[PDB]
Amino acid sequence: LQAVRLYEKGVILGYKRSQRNQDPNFTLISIKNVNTKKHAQFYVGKRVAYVYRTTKHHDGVKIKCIWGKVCRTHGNSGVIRAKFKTHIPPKAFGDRVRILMYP
Amino acid sequence: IDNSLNTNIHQYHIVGRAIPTAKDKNPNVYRMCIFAKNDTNAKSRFWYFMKKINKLKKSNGELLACEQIKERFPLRVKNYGVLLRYDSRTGTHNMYKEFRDTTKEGAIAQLYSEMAGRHRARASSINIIRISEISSSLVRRPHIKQLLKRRLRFPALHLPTLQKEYRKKFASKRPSTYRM
Amino acid sequence: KATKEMLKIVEPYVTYGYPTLSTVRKLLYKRGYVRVGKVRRYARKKIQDNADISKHLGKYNVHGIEDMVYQLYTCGPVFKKVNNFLWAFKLKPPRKGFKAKRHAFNEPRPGDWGNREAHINELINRMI
Amino acid sequence: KKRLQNKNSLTNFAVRCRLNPAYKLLRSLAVLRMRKSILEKSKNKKEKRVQKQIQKKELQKINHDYYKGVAKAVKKKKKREEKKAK
Amino acid sequence: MYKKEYVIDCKGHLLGRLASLIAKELLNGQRIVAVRCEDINISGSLYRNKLKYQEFLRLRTNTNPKKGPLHLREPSKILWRCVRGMLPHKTYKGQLALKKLKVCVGMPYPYDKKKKYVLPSALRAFRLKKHRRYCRLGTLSSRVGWNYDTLVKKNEVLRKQVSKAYYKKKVNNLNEKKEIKTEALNLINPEQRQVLENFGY
Amino acid sequence: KHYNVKGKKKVLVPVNAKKTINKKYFGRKVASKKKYVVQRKLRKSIEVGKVAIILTGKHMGKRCIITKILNSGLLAVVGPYEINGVPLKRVDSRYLVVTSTNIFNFENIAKLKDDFLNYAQDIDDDSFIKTLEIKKKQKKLLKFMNNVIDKIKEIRKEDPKVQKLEGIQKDIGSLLKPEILKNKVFAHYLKSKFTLRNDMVLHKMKF
Amino acid sequence: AVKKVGKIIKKRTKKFTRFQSNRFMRVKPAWRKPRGIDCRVRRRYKGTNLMPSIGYGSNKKTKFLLPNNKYKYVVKNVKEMEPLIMNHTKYCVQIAHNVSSKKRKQIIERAKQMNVSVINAKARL
RNA sequence: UAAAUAGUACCUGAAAUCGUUAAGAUGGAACGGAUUAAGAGAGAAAACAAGUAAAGAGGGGAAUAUUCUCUUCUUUAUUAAAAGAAACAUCAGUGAUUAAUUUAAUUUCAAUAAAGCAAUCCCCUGAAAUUGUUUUCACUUUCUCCCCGCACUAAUGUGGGGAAAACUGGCUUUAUUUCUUCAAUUAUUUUUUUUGCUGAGGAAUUUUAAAAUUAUUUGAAUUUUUCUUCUUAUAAUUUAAGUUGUUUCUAUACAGUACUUUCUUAACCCACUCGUCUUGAAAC
RNA sequence: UUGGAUAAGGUGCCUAAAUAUUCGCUCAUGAGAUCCCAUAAAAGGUGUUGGUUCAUAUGAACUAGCCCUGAAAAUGGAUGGCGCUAAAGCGGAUUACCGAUACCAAGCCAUAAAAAGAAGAAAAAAUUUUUUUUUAGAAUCUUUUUAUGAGUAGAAAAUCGUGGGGU
RNA sequence: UUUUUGUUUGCUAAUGUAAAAGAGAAAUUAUAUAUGUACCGGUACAUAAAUAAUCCUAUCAC
Ligand SMILES: O[C@H](c1cc(C(F)(F)F)nc2c(C(F)(F)F)cccc12)[C@@H]1CCCCN1
Ligand SMILES: O[C@H](c1cc(C(F)(F)F)nc2c(C(F)(F)F)cccc12)[C@@H]1CCCCN1
Ligand SMILES: [Mg+2]
Ligand SMILES: [Mg+2]
Ligand SMILES: [Mg+2]
Ligand SMILES: [Mg+2]
Ligand SMILES: [Mg+2]
Ligand SMILES: [Mg+2]
Ligand SMILES: [Mg+2]
Ligand SMILES: [Mg+2]
Ligand SMILES: [Mg+2]
Ligand SMILES: [Mg+2]
Ligand SMILES: [Mg+2]
Ligand SMILES: [Mg+2]
Ligand SMILES: [Mg+2]
Ligand SMILES: [Mg+2]
Ligand SMILES: [Mg+2]
Ligand SMILES: [Mg+2]
Ligand SMILES: [Mg+2]
């Protein structure tokens, strides 16, 4: 096996939202097999990284990453809210995110 | 202890009396059991009832005692007979219903639901007039009589209520309602 | 009597009841703000120190937060003054939320605006 | 005076102490209370039970009486109904 | 919904609920293949359903029916339409989600060899009381002109035989594996074996 | 030094004021008025001979045994180089998931504990932080490709502190290795990398 | 959004452009406050241009500080340069747009002597 | 000609509008706001390096022509440091979690293992002869037994009619509580597991005084207690007296693909032509 | 502005939050779906679900819930759509959650008011002395504190810019 | 098809992904029962019955 996971998989969903009001300050994350509030709480302090690819190289690379902290659980069904260093692009709304094991 | 199953209807013994007056030094004390969700609600109910019945209002009387009565044998099935007065959109009716339960409070809770569901009678419109435990020789309602059967047995046809952990939207193999 | 009447007049817009001692103390501590200055120019200052209240309430033999709390709990010789001194408690919304602000607490259906005499404290705790 | 933080009294022990001086003593007392072993408590239970009997009986009498009253009322109501029917 | 592509076996499901289930997943970011769409059930009585369909058909654009409501009468098509209804398809994300969904009548080329999933919170057996009238979607489609129902059924039947054949082989393989395991459990190491036993395997 | 407020007993560590801040209306003054900062106090699972998984390093996922509570809060870790490949590596408590498994709980390795402890003690805090000179030297190589890397490696090797650390690591390996090898399964475990799989839920894990 | 750099907080990096300045050429971006009934901007409907307001203003303490943390001072002449001899850490020189090249050079030289930063030294360089 | 994109429609030559080039976008408008994004441009005056040394090019000022000293640019190298961003840690403020805990109070209980007590009996609860009370019969099991139906049942049973007992239950006891219980709801309290966000200010005497805490020292107290409290005195510290520290990184860089910022489209959500008279305008 | 916690309302998907739990009631060959609100009635119904009053386990009469009939208009079509019947309907109850520019906590901006104000070395870096920063005192000004901040007609104040003039 | 390096005059070397970290999993069918197996849809015998709450597949470098 080449490469080791060490993170839980996730899907970076919408922003924190009304019915028709945005709130880009928080993102909503679905974490693989976590379906309840209680389970969600386990991940609360863990660090989240949205890694993404680009055409132009930057710090000599095609992959860059934005970091976040995972702030609180979100309503009954294991979803969590995550707050990031800089707000996530909505291009990301169906994308994968990584929830690391540290803190 | 379960906090999803519980219905917060309690029974309160309330005692009150009209403030004594120079002209009526020795007033009459009135007592009742009242089924309500909290103690303040119970008090309010009592006051309302007083208003309805005698010349008395909260402003010219005082609560003497409020007890809160817990069921003595909260794990003994009991057959409860209840008498109600309710208001419909069209008028007012008296009725008697029977409920097999484990506490008076539980019975009351059941009753409220039933009235809401079957008659569209809202909590405001109902007045409980007496709930008493009926011996099995005096059960008049068939849905309670049936239960009172000897060696009663029935299968379990209900659909499994899985925990929202083991509830998943994608399933391997088509679940079975048959069970056994 | 007058107070009661007033309450009745604004019954459907407020929730009230009997606060209990611990709750009162809590309120004084975490939410207790006080008016410090010459009359009609008050400035909302959090207590923290006893010397802040010992200036105004020094004549009335009520130095320290504890004394104030005591006064609040049971209408002592000097309670009204103490109340006046205390800034209106700017409270949070309840952490579990209200039932329904339209309906009464005494209403058989879920409500709020009634005289919740024994559950007022609970409410306060929830929204402290 | 330049405003600094506004320090939670209920937690920040020092601040609390400053606010209310006797509080320390109270806290100490509480701690002491907490300290005492469960065996003693258990022992006390028996004593409590012993002491409670009469009180318990009284309570029973009260509640029983209430029940009886209720029953009587019900009976009266029934009688009234019967009369009406007649 | 973290799989590459979920194949959903639409037999024995309750239409609208199924659609709803699909839609959310699609929105999230999941490739869904709704397969075997002839056997999706609707909770109304068959006749009622038919009537509803007729009514829907009747609402066409008055000026030029080339535009307006396209009354797609294939069961798969119907399902797709339903899914779309439950989506913000007028935006870009919604459109993408819609695209991600793929609907099939019966079972085609790759979705016979892929694992078929079931949505238990949408099943007819778990959502309807057995004294209520339900309606097979294929039948409904046929009633409102689809024609290719019998053919589809035949195809399904044919596929079933193949599946059975494959299943037998699979079973045999499983048996063989079991036998091997039985044989080899004595050939490992005692402590290790014990450990294995303890942990179910 | 320690303070016992409300019954916590927090333990103080002497700190130095480094940051300077401009005065309100005259000359600058030091930022810190506090002289003692409360000690880190690690979790109730971090011990002295437990095996932990490094989450973030280059040796990402490797299973390395804990060595010394290094006083600065962050702890020392070793995956006995000759077995796992993890050197004498300083690490924070957060970037390591410590397993409930302890080395000194096994019947074979428990007897060689005192020596291990001594070794740990011998390791110090200042032996890790690279002095500026070395860094400068390393930098100086930037102004072919692999050659540069080689040079850097050489420079690293040269460092006396580094050498000492290496020696210590070697000693530890010598002390520990044979026993580990003898417990074959354990050795294998030590060697292997911890990876999450499609069954390991993480939130229900009690490792 | 907010643009923290140092302790320097900027609340609103985006310029407030005139309503509809993007719709008719004749309307310049320069903020003008809309008047008259039915403005939408005046009425502050979700989704329109915002109205500049006093809440947006920078902390009294860091206000006219540039990213450098020095207040910009315009300089036309050596004489003017001189008021900032006792202020090289607090004001930074900008040489007037209309200064001839020789004079500019001289000013730059003076600045270097004074240790005072020049924000536009490169003009005509 | 200094200059012809000053060529006589001639100074400057804006906007609308149009052309060329490039980049981009494009499913029945377009633009816009909020927030990012990827590009594409720009940039170094915070976005690293003061000074020290060797030797060039300059400039000054002073001391009494030529000593001294101050410097700006170039260089060869030579050590800072600071500064921001991380990350972790420590406080403090405000929160979100999951465990609890004190003495109570409110007809709670439940087991334990030996004695018993009463059989339509008991705790109860019914039905009957203004509250208390007297008696009446009514109410428990059962894998028990008998008789009838003779397998008659949804039932590995059963419909009915009868018997049995105290295993079941209830009570009365003597003790027992980590075998299992010690609830629930208030009262008053004390903690704790994780944890998110915030860090304003910079105190020439209110960043003090006190509180608290640590190690001492004298005297008391009933809450006999390694957090027991007051108090006599002394030092220190922070829980006081709004965030500082450690290690990286940018980086041993002068601009780069990083960093800043302008523009550019995207994308999620929102957004109706302004002015106007009008109760009311997006207005057909 | 940041974080929190709510309000009205919601929580199948659209659409953030329950295909939550809990007890009923409804099947509709044009169901129903929440203030204003975007309609339905008299009269029926051996549809089912409760009841009440009577009579001898049936026969009555009633009664009220849901449901059905009564119920017909013109572009195609609208519980907002999709859909939904072990509801995602109707009537409850129990929690949990989501959810505002409202509330709370913190910052900053302005306004208003209030306190108050006509002399002095701090630190760091170097190696006991140099270097680096500042070393404040502008009364409509400075420092700090607290509260507050909608706005057409209108009023006022502070600013900003253009052509010229004296300085 | 395989390999190597790259995609760091309007051009004449050339980059993009709504989604890789194991994106693992082919009976069928009933829901008041199904599936096999063996005979003749019927009979007999097995077997699933919190069915992905599972199973498979990982790290054994040289
Ligand atoms: O929403 C109803 C409906 C539509 C459609 C569809 F558009 F897909 F064909 N199918 C329906 C079906 C369907 F047949 F199962 F698809 C059942 C019930 C109602 C349907 C129609 C739409 C017009 C008004 C109400 N009946
Ligand atoms: O009020 C004093 C003062 C004095 C005198 C003086 F007496 F010289 F005229 N003039 C002052 C002035 C002045 F009048 F402008 F000179 C202003 C402010 C304070 C002054 C202040 C006191 C603090 C130190 C500065 N002078
Ligand atoms: Mg609510
Ligand atoms: Mg108007
Ligand atoms: Mg208009
Ligand atoms: Mg010239
Ligand atoms: Mg020209
Ligand atoms: Mg000219
Ligand atoms: Mg010209
Ligand atoms: Mg017995
Ligand atoms: Mg600060
Ligand atoms: Mg819109
Ligand atoms: Mg008009
Ligand atoms: Mg907010
Ligand atoms: Mg909330
Ligand atoms: Mg949602
Ligand atoms: Mg439909
Ligand atoms: Mg809905
Ligand atoms: Mg205003």
Side-chain angles (χ1 to χ4, degrees), chain A, chain B, chain C, chain D, chain E residues 1-108 110-201, chain F residues 1-5 7-207, chain G:
Chain A
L1 176 76
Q2 53 169 45
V4 171
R5 193 149 72 93
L6 281 175
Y7 64 87
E8 255 280 317
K9 308 173 192 181
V11 177
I12 181 141
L13 303 169
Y15 292 128
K16 197 196 83 177
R17 260 263 236 95
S18 251
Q19 175 217 158
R20 83 210 151 204
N21 262 18
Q22 201 66 165
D23 306 321
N25 296 328
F26 289 104
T27 75
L28 306 170
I29 314 292
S30 277
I31 330 162
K32 206 184 180 181
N33 30 41
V34 15
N35 215 115
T36 48
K37 264 262 294 297
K38 299 281 181 178
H39 299 332
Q41 200 65 41
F42 180 85
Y43 293 91
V44 75
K46 271 70 191 176
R47 203 112 73 82
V48 58
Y50 172 72
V51 288
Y52 63 113
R53 277 116 47 184
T54 52
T55 56
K56 305 296 102 178
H57 292 265
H58 301 122
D59 48 292
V61 291
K62 277 174 172 164
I63 309 158
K64 66 159 70 185
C65 165
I66 36 171
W67 288 99
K69 259 279 181 70
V70 180
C71 79
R72 184 159 135 255
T73 172
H74 187 253
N76 285 298
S77 193
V79 245
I80 50 149
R81 269 183 275 245
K83 183 181 173 67
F84 283 85
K85 205 153 81 71
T86 321
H87 304 117
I88 64 126
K91 193 203 281 82
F93 279 178
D95 207 1
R96 197 153 298 275
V97 87
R98 64 222 324 193
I99 295 152
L100 293 304
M101 285 170 72
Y102 34 91
Chain B
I1 188 79
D2 204 315
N3 202 42
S4 185
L5 250 156
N6 68 324
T7 49
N8 45 237
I9 297 93
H10 300 101
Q11 180 184 218
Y12 298 82
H13 176 87
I14 299 100
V15 179
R17 74 169 183 169
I19 295 161
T21 323
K23 203 163 67 64
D24 191 41
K25 290 160 279 181
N26 208 17
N28 286 117
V29 284
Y30 309 102
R31 132 212 299 172
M32 61 202 304
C33 51
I34 281 300
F35 297 93
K37 321 176 93 70
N38 55 72
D39 195 285
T40 310
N41 282 196
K43 281 160 151 67
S44 79
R45 274 274 90 173
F46 163 86
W47 281 128
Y48 159 76
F49 281 125
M50 287 302 127
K51 185 182 167 181
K52 271 281 177 180
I53 293 150
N54 325 266
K55 297 291 169 185
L56 224 169
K57 290 188 288 177
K58 187 181 173 183
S59 185
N60 52 62
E62 59 220 344
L63 222 99
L64 260 61
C66 204
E67 272 86 338
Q68 205 285 321
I69 312 296
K70 48 200 80 178
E71 193 69 37
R72 202 171 174 178
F73 302 103
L75 298 154
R76 293 201 200 203
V77 191
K78 288 159 186 177
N79 320 309
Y80 286 100
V82 52
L83 205 149
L84 304 161
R85 182 182 193 251
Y86 82 103
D87 283 48
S88 64
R89 65 199 67 176
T90 333
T92 313
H93 314 90
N94 299 294
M95 72 187 300
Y96 186 92
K97 295 188 96 289
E98 296 180 48
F99 294 100
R100 202 162 192 260
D101 217 300
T102 345
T103 167
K104 287 195 155 65
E105 294 83 63
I108 287 294
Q110 268 202 42
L111 160 83
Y112 267 120
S113 299
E114 281 279 322
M115 288 304 293
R118 214 169 293 262
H119 299 105
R120 308 306 144 104
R122 286 146 191 88
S124 302
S125 62
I126 314 160
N127 303 267
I128 292 92
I129 308 165
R130 319 168 235 154
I131 76 158
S132 60
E133 298 177 44
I134 339 161
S135 277
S136 60
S137 184
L138 280 86
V139 58
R140 314 109 58 87
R141 226 98 284 185
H143 77 279
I144 307 294
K145 293 181 185 181
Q146 279 174 194
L147 293 161
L148 279 162
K149 210 151 75 182
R150 208 266 312 273
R151 188 201 162 195
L152 184 66
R153 289 158 89 264
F154 50 97
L157 283 161
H158 64 263
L159 319 100
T161 180
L162 303 166
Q163 273 193 327
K164 202 184 170 171
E165 307 165 46
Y166 318 100
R167 278 189 192 169
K168 44 187 174 69
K169 48 193 176 290
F170 290 102
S172 321
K173 184 188 170 179
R174 227 170 305 266
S176 183
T177 325
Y178 169 81
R179 281 168 152 185
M180 270 289 187
Chain C
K1 183 79 177 178
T3 278
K4 268 186 186 290
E5 258 75 304
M6 285 164 71
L7 233 40
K8 110 203 302 182
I9 283 177
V10 179
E11 190 80 29
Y13 311 97
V14 293
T15 52
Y16 66 93
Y18 316 137
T20 220
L21 163 72
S22 66
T23 301
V24 167
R25 200 198 304 271
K26 200 164 286 177
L27 202 80
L28 264 281
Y29 282 76
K30 292 201 283 186
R31 230 84 218 169
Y33 286 81
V34 95
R35 298 146 89 162
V36 192
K38 284 158 72 184
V39 49
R40 297 316 313 280
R41 287 94 175 89
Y42 290 115
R44 173 175 138 103
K45 306 282 279 181
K46 196 170 180 68
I47 37 186
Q48 284 168 280
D49 190 30
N50 289 338
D52 195 45
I53 75 141
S54 187
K55 282 195 76 183
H56 175 78
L57 295 173
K59 302 172 184 179
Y60 305 91
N61 207 54
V62 276
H63 329 98
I65 185 181
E66 189 64 43
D67 287 49
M68 284 201 297
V69 171
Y70 169 78
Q71 295 303 128
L72 289 156
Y73 188 51
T74 49
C75 293
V78 178
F79 158 81
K80 172 209 178 173
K81 203 133 294 304
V82 179
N83 191 46
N84 209 311
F85 196 43
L86 267 52
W87 193 283
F89 296 94
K90 293 181 169 186
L91 292 166
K92 286 173 66 186
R95 90 85 30 206
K96 211 71 75 181
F98 291 113
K99 293 281 182 180
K101 292 207 287 192
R102 260 86 85 80
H103 307 285
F105 188 77
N106 292 340
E107 262 273 341
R109 68 160 78 188
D112 278 292
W113 62 256
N115 173 31
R116 39 154 62 101
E117 53 176 292
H119 320 272
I120 195 68
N121 78 291
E122 267 84 58
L123 185 78
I124 298 155
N125 289 140
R126 209 159 71 186
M127 67 204 283
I128 203 81
Chain D
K1 290 175 76 182
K2 219 278 169 54
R3 162 256 218 269
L4 308 328
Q5 266 283 218
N6 293 328
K7 219 117 281 181
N8 193 248
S9 34
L10 285 190
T11 53
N12 209 110
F13 180 67
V15 174
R16 222 266 179 77
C17 289
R18 191 206 311 166
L19 264 184
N20 179 34
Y23 164 75
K24 254 204 81 179
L25 198 152
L26 296 166
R27 217 203 74 87
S28 77
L29 290 178
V31 166
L32 286 165
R33 280 192 173 187
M34 290 272 284
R35 281 178 181 268
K36 291 180 180 180
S37 58
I38 324 160
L39 297 162
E40 277 81 293
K41 190 184 178 181
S42 184
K43 287 169 186 177
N44 287 13
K45 288 174 182 176
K46 293 173 183 173
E47 290 184 320
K48 281 184 172 179
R49 279 196 169 188
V50 167
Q51 288 186 325
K52 268 172 184 178
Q53 285 194 1
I54 312 159
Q55 289 182 23
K56 285 180 175 178
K57 283 183 178 181
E58 284 174 13
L59 299 166
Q60 265 204 35
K61 283 184 178 182
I62 221 154
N63 280 295
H64 259 288
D65 273 26
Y66 295 146
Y67 251 90
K68 285 196 176 189
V70 167
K72 283 186 174 182
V74 168
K75 283 191 176 182
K76 287 171 187 176
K77 269 131 206 159
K78 285 185 179 184
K79 282 196 173 184
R80 287 159 194 171
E81 283 185 38
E82 283 187 314
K83 285 175 182 179
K84 287 209 172 191
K86 284 178 182 180
Chain E
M1 45 89 183
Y2 304 79
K3 207 183 195 68
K4 203 281 286 291
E5 188 168 289
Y6 267 114
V7 177
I8 295 171
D9 193 69
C10 290
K11 178 162 185 178
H13 285 298
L14 226 48
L15 207 168
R17 312 198 94 101
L18 199 191
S20 185
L21 276 176
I22 282 182
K24 189 68 187 177
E25 289 151 1
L26 285 177
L27 280 145
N28 294 346
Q30 177 61 55
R31 308 299 290 258
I32 292 160
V33 180
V35 92
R36 215 146 72 108
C37 287
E38 64 153 326
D39 293 310
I40 315 169
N41 297 295
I42 331 149
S43 55
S45 57
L46 191 149
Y47 185 69
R48 174 186 177 87
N49 281 126
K50 190 265 191 72
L51 283 178
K52 274 197 257 66
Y53 207 94
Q54 204 172 133
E55 96 181 302
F56 162 74
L57 208 148
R58 195 223 294 181
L59 30 123
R60 87 203 86 87
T61 169
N62 187 232
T63 182
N64 189 43
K66 299 176 184 178
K67 209 193 276 78
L70 303 166
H71 322 293
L72 315 103
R73 42 211 81 199
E74 301 179 46
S76 67
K77 286 289 98 184
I78 290 157
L79 195 279
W80 172 89
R81 206 187 186 274
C82 196
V83 171
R84 195 234 307 176
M86 312 193 176
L87 285 164
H89 64 99
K90 286 189 176 183
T91 55
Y92 180 77
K93 186 188 175 183
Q95 184 80 300
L96 283 173
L98 222 211
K99 288 293 160 68
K100 289 178 183 178
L101 175 78
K102 190 190 282 179
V103 284
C104 300
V105 195
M107 272 157 64
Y111 314 115
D112 298 37
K113 314 296 166 75
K114 301 288 279 181
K115 171 71 183 181
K116 285 146 281 288
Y117 286 86
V118 172
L119 320 169
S121 57
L123 283 166
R124 170 194 143 267
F126 280 87
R127 274 286 149 190
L128 287 176
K129 286 182 177 178
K130 290 138 206 178
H131 64 97
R132 256 96 212 204
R133 301 270 197 88
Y134 62 95
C135 167
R136 201 184 73 91
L137 225 189
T139 51
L140 186 284
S141 66
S142 181
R143 293 282 192 271
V144 204
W146 177 47
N147 306 329
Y148 309 102
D149 186 38
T150 52
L151 180 173
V152 162
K153 283 185 177 181
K154 187 202 276 80
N155 276 0
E156 272 284 310
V157 166
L158 191 72
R159 191 216 75 211
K160 279 200 280 181
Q161 294 171 343
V162 182
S163 78
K164 187 185 268 75
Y166 154 72
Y167 174 55
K168 208 168 291 180
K169 278 201 168 188
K170 184 204 169 185
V171 164
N172 289 326
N173 207 315
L174 199 76
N175 289 324
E176 289 300 311
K177 189 179 268 75
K178 257 74 180 290
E179 285 175 322
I180 304 164
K181 194 177 279 180
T182 57
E183 195 163 25
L185 269 160
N186 306 312
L187 293 162
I188 331 166
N189 294 128
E191 288 184 15
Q192 294 208 32
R193 144 102 183 214
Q194 194 178 7
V195 166
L196 197 131
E197 284 177 316
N198 189 56
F199 276 82
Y201 319 108
Chain F
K1 274 281 177 70
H2 70 278
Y3 71 86
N4 182 234
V5 70
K8 272 86 168 179
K9 198 170 284 178
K10 288 197 177 181
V11 178
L12 290 162
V13 173
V15 83
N16 60 82
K18 196 178 181 180
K19 194 180 283 178
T20 56
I21 278 166
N22 190 41
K23 216 84 168 187
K24 190 174 183 179
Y25 25 63
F26 60 103
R28 303 175 69 91
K29 103 275 185 72
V30 284
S32 303
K33 56 167 185 170
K34 51 189 175 184
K35 299 165 187 177
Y36 291 85
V37 166
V38 185
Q39 203 161 233
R40 192 173 298 235
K41 190 185 178 181
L42 304 169
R43 88 174 107 270
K44 289 160 279 180
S45 185
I46 299 292
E47 213 178 313
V48 75
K50 277 190 175 180
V51 278
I53 331 292
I54 162 79
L55 284 325
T56 191
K58 196 230 163 199
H59 315 273
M60 191 199 63
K62 266 83 170 67
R63 302 194 168 96
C64 44
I65 108 153
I66 209 157
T67 325
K68 183 211 176 68
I69 315 298
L70 198 123
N71 284 319
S72 183
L74 27 70
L75 40 283
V77 92
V78 289
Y81 184 78
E82 44 268 70
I83 306 163
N84 191 27
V86 177
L88 211 329
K89 173 159 271 190
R90 195 171 66 158
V91 271
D92 194 46
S93 60
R94 308 234 95 167
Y95 297 109
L96 257 61
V97 278
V98 57
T99 66
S100 300
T101 319
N102 207 122
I103 289 205
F104 306 118
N105 282 6
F106 292 93
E107 298 290 312
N108 190 34
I109 332 158
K111 293 174 183 178
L112 299 161
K113 189 185 178 181
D114 296 45
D115 215 15
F116 190 85
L117 280 154
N118 290 5
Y119 294 142
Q121 284 178 328
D122 291 326
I123 315 162
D124 275 43
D125 175 42
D126 296 51
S127 59
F128 284 90
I129 307 160
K130 38 182 166 181
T131 51
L132 289 85
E133 304 161 321
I134 324 159
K135 278 186 171 182
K136 285 205 166 187
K137 275 192 173 181
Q138 284 178 316
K139 285 161 178 181
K140 278 193 171 182
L141 305 163
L142 295 163
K143 278 188 170 180
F144 195 84
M145 212 278 281
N146 288 319
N147 305 352
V148 186
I149 292 162
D150 281 29
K151 285 174 182 179
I152 291 159
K153 283 187 177 181
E154 284 183 328
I155 288 185
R156 224 281 302 194
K157 205 167 187 177
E158 284 170 44
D159 182 54
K161 282 96 79 64
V162 152
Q163 204 86 55
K164 177 196 170 185
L165 205 72
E166 181 70 40
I168 294 161
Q169 160 200 300
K170 204 83 175 71
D171 159 280
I172 290 166
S174 184
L175 164 75
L176 218 59
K177 190 194 184 178
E179 274 65 39
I180 295 178
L181 204 147
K182 286 171 185 178
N183 201 357
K184 192 168 279 181
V185 185
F186 188 74
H188 271 99
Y189 168 80
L190 223 296
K191 286 170 185 177
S192 298
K193 292 187 280 182
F194 170 77
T195 318
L196 289 163
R197 300 203 79 81
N198 300 333
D199 206 306
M200 306 169 79
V201 287
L202 220 173
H203 59 263
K204 284 180 179 179
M205 211 100 76
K206 291 180 181 180
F207 75 108
Chain G
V2 191
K3 192 255 155 180
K4 283 193 78 180
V5 50
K7 276 193 172 183
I8 330 299
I9 300 159
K10 254 79 179 182
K11 292 181 186 172
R12 171 80 168 187
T13 42
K14 275 196 74 71
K15 282 192 174 182
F16 292 97
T17 52
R18 166 89 163 274
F19 180 45
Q20 226 98 65
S21 165
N22 60 286
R23 296 268 276 269
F24 301 93
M25 10 288 179
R26 76 181 179 263
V27 191
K28 294 157 189 179
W31 176 254
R32 217 103 309 179
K33 184 204 178 69
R35 311 286 211 279
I37 35 141
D38 303 349
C39 177
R40 163 177 273 101
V41 172
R42 195 204 70 196
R43 288 164 149 192
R44 298 158 175 168
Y45 278 93
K46 319 139 56 182
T48 342
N49 304 53
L50 296 177
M51 267 183 157
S53 295
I54 207 79
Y56 290 98
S58 300
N59 68 110
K60 277 183 170 179
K61 291 179 179 182
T62 318
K63 205 167 178 184
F64 307 93
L65 299 189
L66 330 172
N68 186 10
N69 280 238
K70 295 175 190 176
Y71 300 99
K72 169 220 281 85
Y73 182 80
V74 186
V75 164
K76 293 180 275 291
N77 199 221
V78 184
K79 286 201 182 179
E80 282 188 38
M81 278 288 301
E82 195 200 35
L84 46 82
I85 190 162
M86 290 259 82
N87 284 308
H88 61 101
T89 203
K90 261 197 171 71
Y91 291 85
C92 55
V93 299
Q94 193 171 45
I95 315 159
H97 75 289
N98 52 50
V99 180
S100 198
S101 186
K102 158 193 162 69
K103 201 84 74 66
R104 263 200 153 86
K105 285 176 182 179
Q106 195 179 235
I107 289 158
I108 289 159
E109 183 193 3
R110 194 47 136 264
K112 224 137 282 179
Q113 291 161 13
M114 283 191 183
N115 206 41
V116 67
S117 45
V118 200
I119 60 170
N120 66 333
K122 250 183 183 71
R124 273 91 97 170
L125 189 75

